[PDB]
Amino acid sequence: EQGKIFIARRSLLDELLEVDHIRTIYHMFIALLILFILSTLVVDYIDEGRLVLEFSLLSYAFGKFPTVVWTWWIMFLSTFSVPYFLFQHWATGYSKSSHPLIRSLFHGFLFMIFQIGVLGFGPTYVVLAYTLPPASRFIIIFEQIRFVMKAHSFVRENVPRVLNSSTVPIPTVNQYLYFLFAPTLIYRDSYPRNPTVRWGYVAMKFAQVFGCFFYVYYIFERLCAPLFRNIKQEPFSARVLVLCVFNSILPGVLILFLTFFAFLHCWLNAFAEMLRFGDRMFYKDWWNSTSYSNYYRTWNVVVHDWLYYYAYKDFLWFFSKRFKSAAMLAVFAVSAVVHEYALAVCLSFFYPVLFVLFMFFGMAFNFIVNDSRKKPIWNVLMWTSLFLGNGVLLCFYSQEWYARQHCP
């Protein structure tokens, strides 16, 4: 059935991390992390005297922070106010008059131009006018996509209701405000209250997300930054970009793992705890996934859920009756266009082949493990090829952005 429920709970990691053997693997992992930190520290201190811990990169990336604070505030207030009261005025007087669609088309057009202009351009304008640095630029683009999807959902959950006729009204501002912070992207008025906020627990999760971000940042500064200088100096057509596409694979793996952990688990669980959300199914065991059709285990449930429900459904609805292939290619096209837009405006670089090559590689992997081929040789090969290929194309992307799209 179509909808959203609250069965799964906690997460998908807190379920395991108290299974004895997995728990001890987890603790060994933490121990190796902390000993790697202490090793780098007290092996580049006694040898260079400085104990560097360079805080250069983020001090430039975060860039103009008060501007993103101010624009995020006005954007939150816009998304919190204008769609709410707009729909409020909308539904209350739906079929008192205007037996044709005139009222509908007109006000829906007002809403559409609101979204596209104010919520599409306003952020894009304030991010391309001041030539924002990517990190803060990424914050703005990210929150703008978030608010676009949340507004589309708040108006997708309630317009088929009022029209089927009593006439369901808009909900309380005291619940809309909450939905604007809920760890989800499907509007519901029904959210289960966990018993109590555990202030110690949310403090621990905030500590974990901040420590995870700082460890990500430190590993970056120490291992991915010097690579970036040495692809900074001579980037055009050296055959020694190979030297580092064979030298950032492992910290690329580490960054992937820790950014997933931090953002998809600690951040979301801490906000859930401060709000007592209840579901906490923010990710699936993506590593076990095998194929796209009917069996995909997304690594991000919120985005996959919104995507499926609000694009694929209505696309099979409108397009045709048996052209599933058309509708699936359509949801691929939607995801591709929005991802390319995000990454392009975020990295001042129009290079649209990244996502589509990602999907070709996903076809490759899924195929080489979806011929009923459980044989571990093929799983190991899939994993090596995943790591290697994502590193390869990451560095080719960084190269093309840095050399051929920098120099004439």
Ligand X SMILES: CCCCCCCC/C=C/CCCCCCCC(=O)SCCNC(=O)CCNC(=O)[C@H](O)C(C)(C)COP(=O)(O)OP(=O)(O)OC[C@H]1O[C@@H](n2cnc3c(N)ncnc32)[C@H](O)[C@@H]1OP(=O)(O)O
**Which of residues 27, 89, 375, 406 is near a copy of itself by CB under 8 A?**
27
Interface mask (CB under 8 A) for a copy of itself, residues 54-73, using x and -? -----------xx--x----
* Residue 292 is labelled as binding a ligand: no
372 touching ligand X, by CB under 6 A: no
Tokens 């092996």 belong to 43
Rounded Cα distance, 271 and 264, in Å: 11
Residue nearest to ligand X (CB): 362
Buried b (16+ CB within 10 A) or exposed e, 106-118: eeeeebeebbeee
298 touching ligand X, by CB under 6 A: yes
Interface mask (CB under 6 A) for ligand X, residues 244-283, using x and -? ------------x---x-----------------------
Residues 288-347 that bind a copy of itself (CB under 8 A): 288
* Residue 23 is labelled as binding a ligand: no
Specify whether 265 is catalytic: no
Q: Are 195 and 165 in contact (CB under 8 A)?
A: no
Q: Are 120 and 148 in contact (CB under 8 A)?
A: yes
**Which of residues 76, 383, 396, 397 is near a copy of itself by CB under 8 A?**
383
Closest to 269 measured CA to CA, from 79, 34, 15: 15
Q: Are 49 and 115 in contact (CB under 8 A)?
A: no
Coil/strand/helix, residue 371: coil
Interface mask (CB under 6 A) for ligand X, residues 329-358, using x and -? --xx--x---x------------------x
* Residue 280 is labelled as binding a ligand: no
Q: Are 137 and 112 in contact (CB under 8 A)?
A: no
Tokens 């120490």 belong to 222
Interface mask (CB under 8 A) for a copy of itself, residues 240-259, using x and -? x-xx--xx-xx--x------
**CB 30 → ligand X: shortest distance, Å?**
19
* Residue 304 is labelled as binding a ligand: yes
387 touching ligand X, by CB under 6 A: no
- Which residues of the shown chain bind ligand X in the complex (CB under 6 A)? 256, 260, 286, 292-294, 296, 298-300, 303-304, 307-308, 312, 328, 331-332, 335, 339, 358, 361-362, 390
- Which residues of the shown chain bind a copy of itself in the complex (CB under 8 A)? 16, 20-22, 24-25, 27-28, 30-32, 34-36, 38-39, 42-43, 46-47, 65-66, 69, 81, 173-174, 196-197, 199, 203, 239-240, 242-243, 246-247, 249-250, 253, 285, 287-288, 376, 379-380, 383-384, 387-388
Query: Catalytic site residues?
Result: 339
> Which residues make up each annotated binding site for an acyl-CoA?
294, 297, 300, 304, 312, 324, 335
